[model samples]
Target: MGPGFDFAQAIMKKNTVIARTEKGEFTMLGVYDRVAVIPTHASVGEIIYINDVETRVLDACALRDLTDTNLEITIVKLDRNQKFRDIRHFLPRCEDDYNDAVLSVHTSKFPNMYIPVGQVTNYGFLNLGGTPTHRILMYNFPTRAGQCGGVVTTTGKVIGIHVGGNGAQGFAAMLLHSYFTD
Candidate 1:
């Protein structure tokens, strides 16, 4: 899927869903075959919906494991009935070797939308919890709360999750292959 792909109909409905946590709801993006990703700020008991269908969070990154690199994501398992539908995307094998320009897409509380934001200026690293973590830094883009789990893509491959932003920049958590396995 490239620029001409039907993002609104196919990508939005199939790849993204609304995650409702006890605290609040945010966007969730589906990756792999059965699991989806959300911001770690969402608790473990959150409910995610693709249309009227629902699923629960099976696991999440613990507070202790958070580094700026890995802090904005949590993984959730789909229910048996929901997983059968065509609704997932594959992540890039690695974070550093991809296009700098990307489409930041999210359904958040509004309709599905995407904006091209990019030319990542810094593949920055920061330490939190006594551990160094990697982060993608790019020029500030339009963003809002509740959009944290939205997918960031380059051409077709999934790369990052919208982690929120501050000042004149936006931040995304690097997607790791291990998040699918462990």
Candidate 2:
């Protein structure tokens, strides 16, 4: 047996596939590797994104956990200046209600940011538990709690603090870094 290896030929043989579809032809632009999917749950105001495990491992190895670290727990309050009066009207009645008030607790940091994550509807009185005085509507994004607030960037920067949108249902929220980073 002879000790030999074909490194140059092996490198030359590696190839990638290009394909065409309704979207048009494009080459696959990623390394051929499998990654595990980690599931996480978050509330309305919270955001989550997937990062490669290798990258996270490198970050952990490079940095030590500390209070002064930029990765420290951050609590941002929503700013409510434009529609202060209207916000006060929807204040929580009890401690339970307060706990469920995701928007109130977090949005208080930035005084100008407000965007409603839910809606409310009125209905005639009915007797099930009590009269159906009013109904609350929830949406994918922040509702009344999230209304009139500036937009928070992924980099923890604040922009476009709360300004009234349009008419009744037409409220506007701030948009930050319209060109560069979203």
Candidate 3:
């Protein structure tokens, strides 16, 4: 007997992945672009399990640095309040203490706006009152590790990568498939 067509469709249609951890099971949605919208409640150190076994081989550390990769992050602090309009001006900074924990990067648009999560402070856009802000997108994931950089889609598209984050808040670069690749 041949494999059922239904089974093939199920396997082909499946694109999302799940990451199991002591806290709970988290879903890692596969995005065609460079960004992914994460919920405000999501935390760090959570696991992300992909449907394909090959994706599992690529861990956070494996994606250190490549170049131009971005992450579409949901800035928890800015949820429902405001949006990161002028994010391009922000700059990225690294934390000295938690250097191995998370990475930070922002735009230069707003110099006074510093995204301080741990020991690092990235200067960028801030709220009208000067409070650190957050933003979310649905196209890209911006970040890179030491060298591996962010993950590109199976089609060679760029995805988000791990940067640095303290315990409070952080910022990640967003690189969409269109912007990253020609």
Candidate 4:
């Protein structure tokens, strides 16, 4: 028999992957445009497994180097065999209703699990050097180690990537609007 289907499951299965360093705890890797989005502060170490399929982190970035957005994110080289879907088109816009319009998918106790918890309670901005980047998507929910770098969604649309938190207030790197633009 086949398992029943769900929106969260489908969204997570297509857009999210699990990753961990040799010495660090588990975290999430968000897939988009054939590349993977990892947190810049994460201790990705020397090796990582996209849910057991081993890979290497070739290069990393802090976003400000390439764009005005100073989000703590790193784009990594992904193997073609890994799942890649276009999540950039699914990002939530500024005009959309953000009250309960956010959900973060995490690894829970292990890799490749979804706990669609949390809501985007607010948002803010960051000024690194150039223009201000309005890319901080905030939430009011406790976070866990494995949830870092996790994908945040609104319904089925991809919105952000969970980065860090303090207590019940966490935030994500509001995703690729200008980061991917050329």
Best by TM-score: 1
Model 3, total clashes: 42
Question: Model 4 clash tally?
Answer: 0
Give each model a TM-score. 0.72, 0.16, 0.24, 0.71
Clashing residue pairs in candidate 4, if any? none
Best by lDDT: 4
C-alpha lDDT (0 to 100) for residue 27 of candidate 2:
18
Query: lDDT score of model 2?
Result: 0.19
The lowest-lDDT stretch of 10 consecutive residues in candidate 4 is: 1-10
The Cα local distance difference test for each model comes to 0.58, 0.19, 0.26, 0.60
The lDDT-based order of candidates, best leading, equals: 4, 1, 3, 2
Q: Compose the digit string of candidate 2's lDDT tens values, residues 2-50.
A: 1111221121123111212232221111111211111011111222121
Q: Which ten residues in a row have the lowest lDDT in candidate 2?
A: 35-44
At residue 43, give the lDDT of candidate 3.
Answer: 40
Give Cα distance to truth, residue 44, candidate 1, Å. 2.9
What are the candidates' C-alpha RMSDs?
A: 4.3, 24.1, 18.5, 5.1
* lDDT tens readout by residue for model 1, 95-165: 46454445445544666566667555546664423445455544457666655666666555566777666
Worst 10 residues of 3 by lDDT: 107-116
Candidate 2 wrongly placed segments (more than 4 Å): 1-160, 165-167, 173-182
TM-score of 4: 0.71
